[PDB]
């Protein structure tokens, strides 16, 4: 009762102003994504040249997926941390996450920085079509 009657004086809200971040933060998120895509490309080129060495207990396909997923996950988490740095004290997403009432740091990251990798059955999106995920992509594309 007491806190809900004080909240009439203070008030709470969620708006688009909370989702939006500084321009510097957006540029940092974009740079992280650019270099992550370049790293995935380098891993792919190593795999094509057969320079990649299999991780013990794993096939080369499994170890390629492991390394690619590690790169993409590190990029995802780093973009999320940049977004979370951008949040001000007044930001209401942060108010709810900090108080623990609802939400999580993951949700803030997905709202502001990067939705992240979409996994189905524990793997990246599978090749439903012949050797390609969707008809728009080229055959044998393991890129991000």
């Amino acid at each position: 009762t007491v806190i809900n009657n004080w909240l009439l004086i203070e008030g709470h809200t969620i708006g688009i102003g909370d989702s939006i971040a500084d321009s510097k933060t957006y540029q940092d998120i974009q740079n992280t994504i650019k270099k992550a895509k370049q790293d995935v490309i380098e891993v792919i080129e190593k795999a094509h040249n057969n320079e990649l060495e299999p991780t013990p207990g794993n096939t080369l396909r499994q170890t390629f997926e492991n390394q690619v997923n590690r790169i993409l996950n590190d990029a995802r988490d780093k973009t999320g941390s940049s977004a979370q740095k951008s949040l001000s004290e007044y930001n209401n997403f942060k108010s709810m996450v900090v108080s623990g009432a609802k939400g999580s740091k993951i949700n803030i990251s997905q709202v502001i920085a990067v939705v992240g990798q979409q996994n189905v059955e524990g793997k990246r999106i599978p090749f439903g079509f012949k050797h390609r995920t969707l008809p728009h992509f080229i055959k044998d594309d393991y890129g991000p």
Binding site: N73, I106, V115, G116, Q117, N119, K123
Partner: peptide, 8 residues
Amino acid sequence: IWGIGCNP
């Protein structure tokens, strides 16, 4: 919808 280690 996040990553392989997270949730879908």
